[PDB]
Structure 1
Amino acid sequence: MYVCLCQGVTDNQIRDAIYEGCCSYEEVREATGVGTQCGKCASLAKQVVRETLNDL
């Protein structure tokens, strides 16, 4: 699904950003743009980050 409609970032793209090097929402934000516009998706994006890290 789209986590961030403003930037067109999917849950899979957040996971892949982590697999590819990111360790934090802040890094995923800079790498993908998630949460940089209205910011309403930040909590959901942080949930995806937390879930992905816990699964590693």
Structure 2
Amino acid sequence: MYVCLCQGVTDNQIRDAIYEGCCSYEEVREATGVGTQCGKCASLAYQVVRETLNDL
């Protein structure tokens, strides 16, 4: 699903960044651009990051 429409980031793309070593929401933002242009997606993006990290 889409997480971030401003940057076109999907939940799979967030997981891809974590599977390449990102270990925090901030690093996922650095790798994907999620949440950089407005406030709408931050809550969802953080939840996807946390669920993904907890499953590793």
Question: Which category of TM-score, normalised to the shorter sequence, fits these structures?
Answer: over 0.9
Segments of structure 1 that go 5 or more residues without pairing to the other structure are none
**TM-score normalised by L of structure 2:** 0.95
- d(CA) in 2 for partners of 1:20 and 1:29? 13
Shift of 1:39: 2.4
**TM-score normalised by L of structure 1:** 0.95
Identity of aligned residues (%): 98
Shift of 1:40: 1.3
Shift of 1:23: 0.5
Give the aligned partner of residue 3 of structure 1: 3
**Local SS of the residue matching 1:37:** coil
Segments of structure 2 that go 5 or more residues without pairing to the other structure are none
The CA RMSD over aligned residues, in Å, is 0.6
Structure 1 runs of 4+ with >3 Å offset: none
**Local SS of the residue matching 1:47:** helix
Give the aligned partner of residue 31 of structure 2: 31
Instruction: Give the number of equivalent residue pairs.
Output: 56
